[PDB]
């Protein structure tokens, strides 16, 4: 009851973008949305993103499997976000703001 179907994903390795997010995470259930954080001017990846699953059960399973998955010298971090999370709103925050709000912990 207390969690959304949305995950925050970070410590992405070089070359790991929206297509790789989809490829790795769609294996756990159908996806409603995949977003990679990018500098709005240069287009450069900020090396984290947000995904939403159609079934929030699947978000829990993806988080359990992909959190601390070691890929290309990176330990992927995955967090299921509490109820009320909305990618449309969270995607707008500066990275340091997500960190201050405790969303990335
Ligand atoms: Cl970081
Ligand atoms: Cl990095
Ligand atoms: Cl690393
Ligand atoms: Cl972390």
Swiss-Prot record:
It comes from the Eukaryota. It is found in: Cytoplasm; Nucleus, Nucleolus. Disruption phenotype: Essential gene. Abrupt growth arrest prior to substantial depletion of ribosomal subunits. Fails to synthesize the 25S and 5.8S rRNA components of the 60S ribosomal subunit, and exonucleolytic 5' processing of 5.8S rRNA is strongly inhibited. Arrests at cytokinesis and fails to assemble a contractile actin ring at the bud neck. Residues 5-83 form the RRM domain. Involved in the biogenesis of the 60S ribosomal subunit. Required for pre-rRNA processing and cytokinesis. Associates with the precursors of the 25S and 5.8S rRNAs. Present with 4280 molecules/cell in log phase SD medium. Component of the pre-66S ribosomal particle. Interacts with NOP7 and RRP1. This is Ribosome biogenesis protein 15. The lineage of its organism: Eukaryota, Fungi, Dikarya, Ascomycota, Saccharomycotina. The chain holds residues 87 to 191 of 220 of the full protein.
